[PDB]
Amino acid sequence: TEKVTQAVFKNFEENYPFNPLYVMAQSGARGNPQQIRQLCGMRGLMQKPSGETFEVPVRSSFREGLTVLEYFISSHGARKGGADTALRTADSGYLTRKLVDVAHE
Amino acid sequence: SKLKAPVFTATTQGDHYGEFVLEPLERGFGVTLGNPLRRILLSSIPGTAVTSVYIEDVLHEFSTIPGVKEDVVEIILNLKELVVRFLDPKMASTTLILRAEGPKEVRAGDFTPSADVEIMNPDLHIATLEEGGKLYMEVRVDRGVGYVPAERHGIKDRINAIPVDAIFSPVRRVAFQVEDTRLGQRTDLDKLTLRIWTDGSVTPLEALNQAVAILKEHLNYFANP
Amino acid sequence: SMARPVSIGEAVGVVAAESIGEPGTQLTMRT
Amino acid sequence: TQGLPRVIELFEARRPKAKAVISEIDGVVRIEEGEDRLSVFVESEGFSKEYKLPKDARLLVKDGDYVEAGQPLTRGAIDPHQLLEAKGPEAVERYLVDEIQKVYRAQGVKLHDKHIEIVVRQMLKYVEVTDPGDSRLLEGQVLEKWDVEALNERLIAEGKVPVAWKPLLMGVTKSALSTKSWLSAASFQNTTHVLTEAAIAGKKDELIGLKENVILGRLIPAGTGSDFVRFTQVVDQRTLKAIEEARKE
Amino acid sequence: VVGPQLKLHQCGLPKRMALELFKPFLLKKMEEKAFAPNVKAARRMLERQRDIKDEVWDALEEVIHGKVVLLNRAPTLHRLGIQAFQPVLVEGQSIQLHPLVCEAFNADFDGDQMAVHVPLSSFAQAEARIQMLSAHNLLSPASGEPLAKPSRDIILGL
Amino acid sequence: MEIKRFGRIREVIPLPPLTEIQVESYKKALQADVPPEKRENVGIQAAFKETFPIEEGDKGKGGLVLDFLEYRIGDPPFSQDECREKDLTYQAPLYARLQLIHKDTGLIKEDEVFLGHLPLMTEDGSFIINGADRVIVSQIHRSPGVYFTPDPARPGRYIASIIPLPKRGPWIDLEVEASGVVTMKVNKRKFPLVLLLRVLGYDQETLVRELSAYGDLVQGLLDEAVLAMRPEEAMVRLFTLLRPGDPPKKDKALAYLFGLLADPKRYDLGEAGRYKAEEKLGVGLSGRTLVRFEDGEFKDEVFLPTLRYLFALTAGVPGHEVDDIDHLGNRRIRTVGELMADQFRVGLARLARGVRERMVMGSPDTLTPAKLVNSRPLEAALREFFSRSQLSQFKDETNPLSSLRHKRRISALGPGGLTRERAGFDVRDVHRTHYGRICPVETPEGANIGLITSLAAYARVDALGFIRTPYRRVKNGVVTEEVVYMTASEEDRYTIAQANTPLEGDRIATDRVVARRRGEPVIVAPEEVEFMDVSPKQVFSLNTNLIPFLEHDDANRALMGSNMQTQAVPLIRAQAPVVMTGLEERVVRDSLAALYAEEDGEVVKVDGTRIAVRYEDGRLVEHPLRRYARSNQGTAFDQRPRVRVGQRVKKGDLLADGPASEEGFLALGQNVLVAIMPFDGYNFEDAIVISEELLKRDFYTSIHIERYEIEARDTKLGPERITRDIPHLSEAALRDLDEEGIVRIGAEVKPGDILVGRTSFKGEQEPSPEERLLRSIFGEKARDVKDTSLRVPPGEGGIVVGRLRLRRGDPGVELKPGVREVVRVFVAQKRKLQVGDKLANRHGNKGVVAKILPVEDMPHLPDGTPVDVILNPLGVPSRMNLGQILETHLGLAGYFLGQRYISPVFDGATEPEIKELLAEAFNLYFGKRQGEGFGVDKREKEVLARAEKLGLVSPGKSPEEQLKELFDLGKVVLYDGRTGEPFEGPIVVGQMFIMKLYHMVEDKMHARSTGPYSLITQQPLGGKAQFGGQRFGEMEVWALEAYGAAHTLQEMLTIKSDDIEGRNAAYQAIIKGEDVPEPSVPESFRVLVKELQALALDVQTLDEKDNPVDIFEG
Amino acid sequence: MAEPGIDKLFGMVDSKYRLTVVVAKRAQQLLRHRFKNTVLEPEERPKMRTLEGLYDDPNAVTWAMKELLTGRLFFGENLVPEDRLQKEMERLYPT
Ligand SMILES: C/C(=C\[C@H](C)CCCCC(=O)O)[C@@H]1O[C@@H]2C=C[C@@H]1OC(=O)\C=C/C=C\C=C\[C@H]1O[C@@H]3C[C@H]1O[C@@H](/C=C/C[C@H]1O[C@H](C[C@H](O)[C@H]1C)[C@@H](O)[C@@H](O)/C=C/CC/C=C/C2)[C@@H]3C
């Protein structure tokens, strides 16, 4: 994958320096290399709920249709993130409050 | 229908550049006038520019003029920054002439004394020669509309002269922008500001007027014959 | 944050709490 | 542990899971025995202190190594209370700030140390008395208000007892909790305790902080409500000379 | 809603909500500027169900000239979770927000709302326009770095 | 438009009835169309049996029994609508044919009894409860069985869990402490296990025989020599231990509860309890945690053999593993039927105690059923459910899909057996298994993420609450037509091949067959495959299934577009999307929002009101259209006729459309001409740019309906009365009120307009004379009654579309004590897209309209057509919802090619196909331009040029040949409206289906200056004339402290809230062009000081000279 | 279009908040006498655009900042006592 990812990025450079996806990612605009990979190259090694990695990778990339099993294997992640954010957004200004109650004066 | 005739403010410097602000225009009309004027403004106003140069000793822009502290390139450019007004309203061609001292720095107001043709910016740093410096020049001036590169016209006054890019257009910059203004409950009415920079030659306001006249003229062609 | 020395009367405590606090979000909670 | 849980662990001075042992004493290291039972000795001339490890523990001093007063033997996190007594209050301050930042940094965040510093110092606001001069011998006292006695009874009214104290690492909450002004103290988990107490003693506020004056609806003691600026008057050319001509009357 | 049009120190404010936000001020202005014999009669013609007379918008506008408002979004996490602005009288019912100010507010044009407030006393105005005007708070107080940076679209163009 | 269908895999099974979960559940709990002889347990049938050989006090001396024979479901006293009108719950009385016997004999079967009222489910799946349609969401809990688990408080050790069916036994946990002691934890009481084991007769030496030499574990369970005693004495001590107080030897009594009989521990009649307790544990079982009356002494059946596996897991040979609590072979589904039935249990449970209570109070000679039964413990226990249980939501009615999807929801929370909103993280994650059953995508974004979920399209909950997915048995080579739905556990033992997999005719075609087994993705030999996916549609929800190119959308943004569709409000010109997925017709079908034929006949009558069809011979029915009725969420459900006068009807085909329906297919929005490019900062961040064109064409416009309600109550001061005779009111204010006080229909209502007039009495003083003298002399008759009418609240208003009146008395009507008559006014409102509204697409590209442009602006194709909405590219790359991009491309085909598309999920269009269609399109689109007299104007040539410098067109091709190049890559040369000059470098343009969501600026946006201050809290709150007042949170208090904003903060703390003195001084200053403040003393301060005095405590306020101040002067 | 001349204004004072306090305290007096109090008068006064010509800007604080910016006013931290400050104040046409 790191071979595909690096490759998908030196292609833009060598042919297509004004390609949007690139131009954007390159400039401050939008996108980071992590995202251009899933879009153009290859999604990679998915990990299972019990941490352990699948030894079958997601071989496709959004551009090309990725496939139900790949979609399912890679949907575990797309829940582990949603649960993570729902915890660090849960507590409003938990720590700020603590920090203000000491500091304020 | 509704909305009264707008107010047209003009604020100017007096040769180059003036702002022009016709105010409450209905939504849309801002651009509708603004842009076509700019097009006309940058494209179709009649002026005059250096179009061909002969330098005694040396063809090619890419040569060595000796005794000249500068070189052919900076001269060509320098020349393009020259403006000359044709007093003689019939003529459509003129040739200018230069004769250069030793230790001296040649301004544009050191041209051939010639009456009938009016150098508008007498300063301007044309060239500079060293002790024992020799420069003679035959510079052609032409009536015209846009910006016309040499690679197009190819004006050959001599069989040794190099031809320059023509910027015959007294307007050098047009920048316009419509913002919203308010009349009563209506906060989103067009307000077009027109910013015209012309080389001290044709005024911005004159520029604008000419520009309008061209579009109107043209608009009268939409008359069934 | 106007890149000069502080003004007397800067409520620095709260400013700190906020500074340390606002990023509190984009840190992951997995511990 | 990582993330926000770490930052609390830190801001709250919390004796963590995997305290990963530190040596209390200077001296020379000696790892002994594998799989059966794993223990590590840091024995200098004289004392031989012994530090029994989980066995699973991934210790990070190999045999023979010389060691430091409070140096980590084992890896893992470090107890900020064990660090206080073994190696003082500054070393503490310096651990807290540099660890808290170890996370914001590790993630993506960039903030200035001073913020964390400002807070950390407050975690060190108070100290407990050992052998007093005036008050009861056990009480916790603000670092500064003890100098209001230490360098007071050793200058003008010199004598008695300089009041000996101990450095006291207060977690962010606990420290916020023990905060002089009752108005502020009231807004925390048990308002009664505060008032009951503060009523018995003719306790007074003075209202130094902000949490105070917002409670009362008073004009915050900061910014434009800073004593250093709010008294500023503006007199106006002709107003000044005309005000001068009724002063000598 | 995004307001690309504004300058850094300006605002949304639908006419309706300016008017009301500012009502009492307008009443005295209406009187000050003829139509409206008394402030109690100024109150009256502002009530007659709907349809507002141009002079009053013109008054309102004068009322506002150089006063600022406070905008504020969602989780106010640092001081830049409030910013002052000069209100612009604008069409429609959404508040309009300068694109450069977004980052600090963490505003995202997909359903966000923001409340607005009017500092009343001259002090509090002063307070807002010197200390909290969006355009005096250009750099992060956390890391002295610019917080009002070009971004997501401006960059693209440049 | 002709439709082009995409992709292979021929759908072997159509989607099952969808609302199946709900509708078929109830049925089998209410065998109402089955003779009371059959009725094989479960449901209400069993819930009686579970209770109803009911004895009385003492064990075989006093007579009277009372035995259930059969129940009878009554008949609905009010039509499905009367209910929703009169404010009632669609019910039917329930009767029990009970029978009470005696000691002198006397079989009295009192002709049924009324035990209570049973709420009936609709065709829908939904209920009606006190008006208002409620849905009971199906919950999930631990499927009963025996489990073990690791021990969170003691590492390297284990607990043991004996968990029975909900409301059918207690929770028994077994865990060994640092003492060694094994301890039973039941009903939150903990005694040494041994004590029980002693009772069940195990002997100090039998235990070691059975439970020794793995671990020194017995050694702990032992030592209680003291109570390794007389099994009877054991029993006494354990009864004293479980219920402190009564110390006798009838301890068999209670010990019979957590033992034998179908009173408690009935972990199944002979199902998923016994079964799974056998395989995990040491086999051979009956049905209760132990058996009692073996002859008069208990005989253990589960306790010890569990303990075995408990010890045999604290060292233990392989095979004695832990248990996956999150496996769906460990997760059960309580559907409506069962919860409703479980509630009968609570009812009948209570009804029994209060029979045995009346068996004791009464003379046994005359006691009858009817004289023993009360009819209120069944009611109050089952009224309570449908009304007050968490599981009984309202009914998400925004659009057809939203509703449909509600019924298929699954949640781990709910009542008792349910985790709180502060536990469970291992639960939340999409565990392997969910595949085909639950959705890896539908969950709400925060808080209850994973605690709630969607049932999958093909999934089916079964027999005992396990979800089952369809599969295709492949007889070693050939893909058989036989379809096998199978458990989450009955799956971990096979090798199942994917549907994406090819085939030749009826058999596998490739040599390296993809498939999974247990969980791992596995590559497998064809002959080495056993089963096959029926479709990829198996894997996702109904809504997640509607996203035409899901394959290409990152799963996060997919979940955004899966919901968000559920927010999509119905539209007047609602239209089925250009690029569909298949279920769009069926979703509308199973929702029954659309009206469909009954039996292929012929339409006779057709108007905005009725469609009446003559069904072949079978009489004639008239189908009334619900028309501009108001959905729970204020949406406007309204049917439109889709069929002409005198036409033959297709079997069961669209007679009428629903609210979000276009000729039978789903229509959550509009498809509309889009261009993905930046505008001028107007589509910054997520904002959309609109063309006014859309408003002129009344596109994104929708009809919302508010609902206002007023009550008239009786009062210590006299009756609240609904007159139009409202005091002082000008006969112009009353203008729209009928002679009753209630607005006319079709009345146009602005804020502050009487909607329902109502005078209340109120005794706010007595007028002292002079005033009374003045009153007559100048005419106006002093009145006894205040105004208090209804009136339209600030912000609202529209057209009056219907009234509703309910009077205390009136037949079925039952309003609450005090309330006497209730009025309901309904107010419609066309809406229309607006800056501030939010449009979304199927791939989760949400965003607010931030500028409407007049068509003069707006990028336009060369032919002249303008686009409609300008969507920003910068939106795409970071979220990875590439499907939207593809969708625009196929769509662009459509526009020109004149067709819509059905592209299945992971089976729809490929680029090869898409670009073939774009080819065909350009050939007609450009064929026109030529055939009309044109081709490739300077503007396109100037673009096409730099377009190849951009390596986007093939060099050495004709501008026409280069145009196609681009049109095929899906981009086009757009033209700037403002200035005819072409956008430099091509733009992708096309048709994208876009929805209007539940939110609108109309409902938001409020601004106050002053007014209504509460008399309780004294800070502004509520607004009869002017509204609102915004909260200044503690977070904002910080910000102001962070800025130096002293006075500004103090302003927010005094003069714009409680500080009466202050605000008044301030507003009196603004009126008069004065500076405002000098606020004397923060009211806050005074208040606190006084609120302190009240509690003793002096609170001296003192200046710097330390003397006192008096912040009061009075 | 940030506050007009504020960079200069911040530099005039020690602690910035002082600036606010002066602006406020001035915009105060400048209001409590109809602007018959200006130092800047001639053709310095700030003004307003309209459906009408240039009218006197009615913003005290806006005036206050323009005023201050000309060195024509003074910041007494403790110069001239508060008792005498409200004295000669209500004099030059106050009511
Ligand atoms: C949080 C919750 C119910 C909430 C009111 C709604 C869920 C919020 C999640 C979300 O929408 O993101 C819980 O729900 C149940 C049991 C315990 C919990 O109770 C709870 O924590 C809280 C409340 C539980 C029940 C409340 C019932 C009553 O409260 C009000 C009147 C009664 O019905 C409520 C209507 C709820 C329907 C919702 O429907 C959703 C959209 C809106 O949230 C609502 C229209 C739809 O998207 C629908 O598909 C979602 C259904 C949620 C399924 C969850 C079932 C388990 C309404 C809010």
Short mmCIF file of C-alpha atoms in Angstrom, two decimals, chain F residues 408-620:
data_model
loop_
_atom_site.label_atom_id
_atom_site.label_comp_id
_atom_site.label_asym_id
_atom_site.label_seq_id
_atom_site.Cartn_x
_atom_site.Cartn_y
_atom_site.Cartn_z
CA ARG F 408 -37.62 -1.55 11.95
CA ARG F 409 -35.48 -0.01 14.72
CA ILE F 410 -33.62 -1.98 17.38
CA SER F 411 -32.38 -0.68 20.71
CA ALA F 412 -30.40 -2.07 23.57
CA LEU F 413 -31.85 0.48 25.97
CA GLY F 414 -35.44 0.63 27.15
CA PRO F 415 -36.96 -0.82 30.33
CA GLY F 416 -35.19 -2.81 33.08
CA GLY F 417 -33.39 -5.36 30.92
CA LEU F 418 -31.52 -2.55 29.18
CA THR F 419 -28.23 -0.70 29.71
CA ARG F 420 -28.31 2.93 30.87
CA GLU F 421 -27.11 6.06 29.05
CA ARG F 422 -23.73 5.70 30.85
CA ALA F 423 -22.55 2.14 30.04
CA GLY F 424 -21.49 -0.08 27.12
CA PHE F 425 -18.68 0.49 24.61
CA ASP F 426 -17.86 -3.09 23.58
CA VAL F 427 -21.58 -3.29 22.73
CA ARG F 428 -21.61 -0.21 20.47
CA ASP F 429 -19.05 -1.38 17.88
CA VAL F 430 -20.47 -3.14 14.79
CA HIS F 431 -19.58 -6.67 15.85
CA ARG F 432 -18.96 -9.25 13.16
CA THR F 433 -22.25 -11.14 12.84
CA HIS F 434 -24.31 -8.00 12.23
CA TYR F 435 -23.81 -8.85 8.59
CA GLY F 436 -27.16 -9.35 6.88
CA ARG F 437 -29.04 -8.96 10.16
CA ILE F 438 -28.32 -5.55 11.75
CA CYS F 439 -26.91 -2.59 9.78
CA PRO F 440 -23.22 -1.58 9.89
CA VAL F 441 -24.76 1.80 9.06
CA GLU F 442 -27.78 3.76 10.41
CA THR F 443 -26.96 4.63 14.05
CA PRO F 444 -27.32 8.22 15.44
CA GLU F 445 -24.06 10.21 15.43
CA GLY F 446 -23.67 10.93 19.18
CA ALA F 447 -24.75 9.69 22.65
CA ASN F 448 -26.76 6.61 21.60
CA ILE F 449 -24.38 5.67 18.77
CA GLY F 450 -24.66 1.87 18.50
CA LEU F 451 -27.26 1.69 21.27
CA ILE F 452 -29.91 1.96 18.57
CA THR F 453 -29.87 0.40 15.09
CA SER F 454 -31.73 -0.56 11.88
CA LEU F 455 -32.95 -4.04 11.03
CA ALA F 456 -31.52 -5.08 7.60
CA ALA F 457 -33.66 -5.38 4.43
CA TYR F 458 -33.70 -9.18 4.18
CA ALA F 459 -33.21 -9.86 7.89
CA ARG F 460 -35.93 -11.62 9.87
CA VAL F 461 -36.34 -12.02 13.62
CA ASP F 462 -37.37 -15.59 14.37
CA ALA F 463 -39.07 -18.05 16.67
CA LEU F 464 -36.92 -16.95 19.60
CA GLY F 465 -35.69 -13.44 18.86
CA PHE F 466 -32.66 -14.25 16.70
CA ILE F 467 -32.29 -12.34 13.44
CA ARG F 468 -31.94 -14.55 10.40
CA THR F 469 -30.43 -13.69 7.01
CA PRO F 470 -31.23 -15.52 3.73
CA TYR F 471 -28.56 -17.61 1.99
CA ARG F 472 -28.25 -19.72 -1.12
CA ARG F 473 -27.21 -23.36 -0.64
CA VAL F 474 -24.77 -24.30 -3.42
CA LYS F 475 -24.76 -28.09 -3.96
CA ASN F 476 -21.00 -28.52 -4.56
CA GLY F 477 -20.82 -26.58 -7.85
CA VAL F 478 -24.36 -25.51 -8.78
CA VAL F 479 -26.06 -22.52 -7.15
CA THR F 480 -29.42 -24.03 -6.07
CA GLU F 481 -32.62 -22.00 -6.00
CA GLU F 482 -33.24 -23.04 -2.36
CA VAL F 483 -32.90 -20.23 0.15
CA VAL F 484 -31.86 -20.84 3.74
CA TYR F 485 -32.35 -18.19 6.37
CA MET F 486 -30.06 -19.03 9.26
CA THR F 487 -28.88 -17.90 12.68
CA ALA F 488 -25.84 -15.87 13.64
CA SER F 489 -24.54 -19.10 15.20
CA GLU F 490 -25.87 -21.47 12.50
CA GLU F 491 -23.49 -19.51 10.19
CA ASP F 492 -20.14 -19.79 11.96
CA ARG F 493 -19.92 -23.40 10.78
CA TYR F 494 -20.27 -22.87 7.01
CA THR F 495 -18.26 -21.27 4.15
CA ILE F 496 -20.49 -18.71 2.46
CA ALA F 497 -19.71 -17.19 -0.95
CA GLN F 498 -20.35 -13.55 -1.80
CA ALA F 499 -22.92 -12.37 -4.36
CA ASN F 500 -20.38 -10.13 -6.15
CA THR F 501 -19.00 -13.50 -7.27
CA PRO F 502 -19.69 -14.42 -10.94
CA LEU F 503 -21.60 -17.42 -12.33
CA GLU F 504 -22.28 -19.40 -15.51
CA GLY F 505 -25.99 -20.18 -15.90
CA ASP F 506 -26.74 -21.70 -12.49
CA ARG F 507 -23.21 -22.39 -11.19
CA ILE F 508 -19.94 -20.79 -10.02
CA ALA F 509 -17.71 -19.72 -12.92
CA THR F 510 -14.34 -18.59 -11.51
CA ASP F 511 -11.59 -20.67 -9.89
CA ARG F 512 -10.66 -18.57 -6.80
CA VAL F 513 -14.01 -18.10 -4.95
CA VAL F 514 -14.28 -15.32 -2.37
CA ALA F 515 -16.23 -16.07 0.75
CA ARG F 516 -16.11 -15.73 4.49
CA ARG F 517 -16.31 -18.24 7.33
CA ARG F 518 -17.06 -17.46 10.99
CA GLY F 519 -15.80 -13.93 10.37
CA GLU F 520 -12.52 -13.95 8.43
CA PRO F 521 -12.61 -13.03 4.74
CA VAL F 522 -11.48 -16.22 3.03
CA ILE F 523 -10.37 -17.31 -0.44
CA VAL F 524 -11.75 -20.73 -1.23
CA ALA F 525 -12.03 -23.44 -3.90
CA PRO F 526 -15.43 -23.51 -5.72
CA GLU F 527 -16.23 -27.10 -4.64
CA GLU F 528 -15.14 -25.97 -1.14
CA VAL F 529 -18.04 -23.47 -0.94
CA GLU F 530 -21.39 -24.31 0.67
CA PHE F 531 -23.67 -21.24 0.67
CA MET F 532 -24.09 -17.97 -1.25
CA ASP F 533 -25.19 -14.34 -0.53
CA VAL F 534 -28.59 -13.64 -2.09
CA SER F 535 -27.65 -10.02 -2.71
CA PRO F 536 -25.31 -7.38 -1.25
CA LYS F 537 -28.62 -5.66 -0.29
CA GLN F 538 -28.61 -8.24 2.51
CA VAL F 539 -25.90 -6.23 4.25
CA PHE F 540 -27.45 -2.79 4.65
CA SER F 541 -30.60 -1.01 5.99
CA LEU F 542 -33.60 0.11 3.97
CA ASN F 543 -32.32 3.71 3.85
CA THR F 544 -28.70 2.70 3.49
CA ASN F 545 -29.99 0.67 0.59
CA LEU F 546 -31.37 3.71 -1.26
CA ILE F 547 -27.92 5.22 -2.02
CA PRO F 548 -27.37 4.46 -5.73
CA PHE F 549 -23.57 4.22 -5.66
CA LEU F 550 -22.93 3.21 -2.03
CA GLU F 551 -19.90 1.19 -3.13
CA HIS F 552 -18.25 4.55 -3.93
CA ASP F 553 -19.20 6.44 -0.80
CA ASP F 554 -17.06 6.38 2.29
CA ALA F 555 -19.16 4.75 5.00
CA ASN F 556 -19.21 7.78 7.23
CA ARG F 557 -20.89 10.04 4.67
CA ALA F 558 -23.07 7.08 3.71
CA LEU F 559 -24.48 7.01 7.19
CA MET F 560 -25.08 10.77 6.93
CA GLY F 561 -27.04 10.25 3.72
CA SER F 562 -28.78 7.20 5.11
CA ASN F 563 -30.33 9.31 7.84
CA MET F 564 -30.87 12.84 6.43
CA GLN F 565 -33.06 11.06 3.92
CA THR F 566 -35.31 10.56 6.94
CA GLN F 567 -35.33 14.32 7.42
CA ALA F 568 -36.35 14.89 3.85
CA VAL F 569 -39.74 16.70 3.90
CA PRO F 570 -42.23 15.88 1.12
CA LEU F 571 -42.68 18.31 -1.73
CA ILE F 572 -45.57 19.56 -3.88
CA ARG F 573 -43.77 18.63 -7.07
CA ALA F 574 -41.99 15.74 -5.29
CA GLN F 575 -40.04 13.60 -7.78
CA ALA F 576 -38.39 10.20 -7.79
CA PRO F 577 -34.62 10.59 -8.18
CA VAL F 578 -32.86 10.33 -11.56
CA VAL F 579 -30.60 7.50 -10.38
CA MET F 580 -32.42 4.90 -8.28
CA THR F 581 -31.53 1.63 -6.52
CA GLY F 582 -34.67 -0.50 -6.70
CA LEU F 583 -36.42 -0.36 -3.31
CA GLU F 584 -37.86 3.11 -4.05
CA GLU F 585 -41.16 1.65 -5.35
CA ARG F 586 -41.36 -0.95 -2.64
CA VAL F 587 -40.48 1.38 0.27
CA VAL F 588 -43.55 3.42 -0.66
CA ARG F 589 -45.54 0.20 -0.96
CA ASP F 590 -44.80 -1.30 2.48
CA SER F 591 -45.30 2.08 4.18
CA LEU F 592 -48.97 2.18 3.02
CA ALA F 593 -48.80 5.96 2.61
CA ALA F 594 -49.80 5.37 -1.01
CA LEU F 595 -53.21 3.97 -1.97
CA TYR F 596 -53.25 0.85 -4.10
CA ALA F 597 -55.96 -1.29 -5.78
CA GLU F 598 -57.42 -4.30 -3.99
CA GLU F 599 -58.45 -6.70 -6.81
CA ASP F 600 -57.94 -5.83 -10.51
CA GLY F 601 -61.17 -4.03 -11.42
CA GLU F 602 -62.12 -0.75 -13.08
CA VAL F 603 -62.09 2.79 -11.78
CA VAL F 604 -65.44 4.52 -11.89
CA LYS F 605 -65.08 7.79 -9.96
CA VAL F 606 -62.02 10.06 -9.49
CA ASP F 607 -61.68 13.41 -7.71
CA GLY F 608 -59.44 15.24 -5.22
CA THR F 609 -61.59 13.61 -2.55
CA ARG F 610 -62.30 10.01 -3.55
CA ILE F 611 -61.18 7.35 -5.94
CA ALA F 612 -63.95 4.82 -6.44
CA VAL F 613 -63.34 1.63 -8.38
CA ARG F 614 -65.59 -1.21 -9.45
CA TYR F 615 -63.53 -4.32 -8.66
CA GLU F 616 -64.34 -7.18 -11.10
CA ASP F 617 -67.77 -8.35 -9.84
CA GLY F 618 -66.68 -8.02 -6.16
CA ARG F 619 -68.94 -5.03 -5.34
CA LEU F 620 -67.75 -1.42 -5.38
#
